[PDB]
Design a protein around this ligand. Structure first.
Ligand SMILES: NC(=O)c1ccc[n+]([C@@H]2O[C@H](COP(=O)([O-])OP(=O)(O)OC[C@H]3O[C@@H](n4cnc5c(N)ncnc54)[C@H](O)[C@@H]3O)[C@@H](O)[C@H]2O)c1
Ligand SMILES: NC(=O)c1ccc[n+]([C@@H]2O[C@H](COP(=O)([O-])OP(=O)(O)OC[C@H]3O[C@@H](n4cnc5c(N)ncnc54)[C@H](O)[C@@H]3O)[C@@H](O)[C@H]2O)c1
Lengths: 259, 260
């Protein structure tokens, strides 16, 4: 039981898992025997998701829910509690990136990013904790970034959020760890998504720059995050708590490749 | 010697929420180093109290009633200081609130407030003062973080999330505007001996005992302890210090604790 990475009979909710990282994590959760749920912002994105989960032989329970709407989240959770069962594994994947110079950035924009990337993980975690606290078992995996440690130009708001989510992780660990709730975090490095496929075509200055910073000397395929994700959702990581598990391929440990 | 000048002679400074407490100490110290001091608070009563205390130390503080979550109001406050006193050189995002509520019982409205004031506002205020700084190619932005920028505790959920975000905000303003010779650093106060906490140091108190255990220096930090660090980060001596959270804890974050 100290080495069981099985998620057999565990209810899982991965927010924003219609595609991308969240999808890969939810797919792998199903593969480990978890009853998978997910949500997105509109019906179109849910239907696309449901189709892809079906396409791998997965009965995903999709929901149209805005994570910044607390009443709507509260409902979504009670619906999953009714239909599927009380949530055991929360993965706050849902989030948005915005590239705007900070001095030029609208106050409305900044707030949006914080609301979805920071406050929402609060709201969703708040909803699923009463369930977990009763049964004295739970997992809450917040998807942080490398921006939880490092800043860059334009991504000011996004970093502020992810750095805040990092502490939110540590605080949910602090407060609810006694109920045998493990709240950890996953910090993806440079992930090779379909959107970034152009940047790996013919010696590209960007791909060269990334493979320099990365000791592993490559981009990380999203599925690389699934192993870690399962691990933090498993009963093997019950002693891991308040921890940000960076899956970067060595970047945060490396000063860089220098001529 | 311009690498060792801790003087703030002829530097305009804005310490948000500096009617009393840490912000007050920092601003009083800034004045003492020759800074033209400005501050703001949420209503006229708190500004007037503040102005009185600065006046009582022989300091001509330029007080303003401004909410830091109201961007237009802040935009205004900055331009007024630009007009009357001069373009801002030293920003200190001191203004902020603490809220102790179990996360699962906390209203979403409450959580947002704390983030808005403690995280988003520092953005708004920094946003307003940066154009000025970027022109003159010289500026200091000091965000007052906490130990909650590293460690969580019960009830202080939202507050931690805010301060941990402000920590990265600090690192990002360093990343983005460092090239204009703008140093954005942070100060992380430990357990500060405030007037509010005076009861907790009366007669062996379990709390005072617990704090002195966790603290190597074996004591509470008087607010004025933060002033030295603050001046240092505002001075031209700390020009190479950038994106850095200077924790002023008395050793707490380095110490696992006193154990029987
Ligand atoms: N290389 C990377 O792509 C990378 C690196 C580090 C971290 N991350 C993080 O990984 C997570 C997943 O990102 P991704 O690459 O899969 O794409 P993404 O950020 O687009 O995924 C988020 C999903 O949530 C949805 N969503 C947005 N707002 C929502 C709301 N209010 N309520 C509900 N759903 C909402 C989006 O439509 C989307 O499907 C994010 O938190 C992101 O910050 C990604
Ligand atoms: N032991 C401590 O007190 C301690 C420890 C670590 C960090 N800090 C941090 O240091 C800073 C200063 O602490 P403090 O005790 O001096 O002050 P405080 O926490 O009592 O509040 C700071 C000031 O900001 C003002 N303010 C609040 N909201 C405002 C708004 N919207 N617009 C304008 N002004 C507003 C308040 O009126 C107050 O005078 C805060 O960021 C606090 O979180 C304090």
């Amino acid at each position: 039981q100290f080495l069981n990475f099985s998620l057999e009979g565990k209810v899982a909710l991965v927010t924003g898992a219609s595609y991308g990282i969240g999808f890969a994590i939810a797919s792998a959760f199903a593969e480990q025997g978890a009853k998978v749920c997910f949500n997105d912002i509109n019906q179109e994105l849910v239907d696309k998701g449901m189709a892809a989960y079906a396409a791998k032989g997965i009965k995903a329970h999709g929901y149209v829910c805005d994570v910044t709407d607390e009443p709507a989240v509260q409902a979504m959770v009670a619906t999953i509690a009714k239909e599927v069962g009380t949530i055991d594994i929360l993965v706050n994947n849902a989030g948005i990136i915005r590239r705007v110079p900070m001095h030029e950035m609208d106050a409305a924009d900044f707030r949006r990013v914080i609301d979805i990337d920071l406050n929402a993980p609060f709201i969703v975690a708040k909803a699923v904790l009463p369930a977990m606290m009763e049964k004295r078992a739970g997992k809450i995996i917040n998807i942080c970034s490398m921006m939880s440690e490092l800043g860059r130009e334009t991504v000011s708001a996004y970093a502020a959020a992810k750095g805040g989510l990092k502490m939110l992780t540590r605080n949910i660990c602090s407060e609810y760890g006694e109920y045998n709730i493990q709240c950890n975090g996953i910090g993806p490095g440079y992930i090779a998504t379909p959107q970034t496929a152009p940047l790996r075509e013919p010696r590209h200055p960007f791909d060269s720059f990334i493979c320099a910073k990365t000791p592993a000397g490559r981009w990380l395929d999203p599925e690389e995050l699934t192993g870690p994700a399962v691990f933090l959702a498993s009963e093997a990581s019950n002693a891991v708590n308040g921890h940000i598990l960076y899956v970067d391929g060595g970047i945060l440990a490396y000063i860089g490749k220098q001529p």
